[PDB]
Amino acid sequence: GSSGSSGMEEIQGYDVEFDPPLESKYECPICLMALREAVQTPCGHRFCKACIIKSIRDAGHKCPVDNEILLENQLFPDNFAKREIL
Numbered sequence: 048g049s050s051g052s053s054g055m056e057e058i059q060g061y062d063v064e065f066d067p068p069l070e071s072k073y074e075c076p077i078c079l080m081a082l083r084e085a086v087q088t089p090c091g092h093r094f095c096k097a098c099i100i101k102s103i104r105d106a107g108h109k110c111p112v113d114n115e116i117l118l119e120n121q122l123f124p125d126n127f128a129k130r131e132i133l
C-alpha cells in the first residue's frame with residue numbers, strides 16, 4: 048500500500064523599481080515624448096507641429112491643455128521669417 052504521492056510548488060517574483068529619464072526639456076503634454084518639431088503656440092504652450100495639427104483636425108480649434116480657440120495659421124512662432132505671397 049503506497050497510495051501514490053502528492054506535493055506542491057509555488058514560485059513568485061515581485062519588484063517595484065524604475066529609473067526616470069532626465070526631464071530637463073519642455074515635453075509634449077499630448078504625446079508625452081520628445082517634441083518632433085518643437086513648435087510653440089500663441090496661447091502659451093509647446094507642442095509638436097504634428098501633434099497640434101492632429102488635435103485641431105481631430106477635435107477642433109482648441110488647446111489640448113486649455114482648449115483655447117487656436118488656429119493653425121497662427122503657428123510656427125519659432126520661424127523668424129513670415130513668407131506670405133512674397
Ligand SMILES: [Zn+2]
Binds near residue numbers: 077079095
Ligand atoms: Zn507631441
Ligand SMILES: [Zn+2]
Binds near residue numbers: 088090091092114
Ligand atoms: Zn495652450
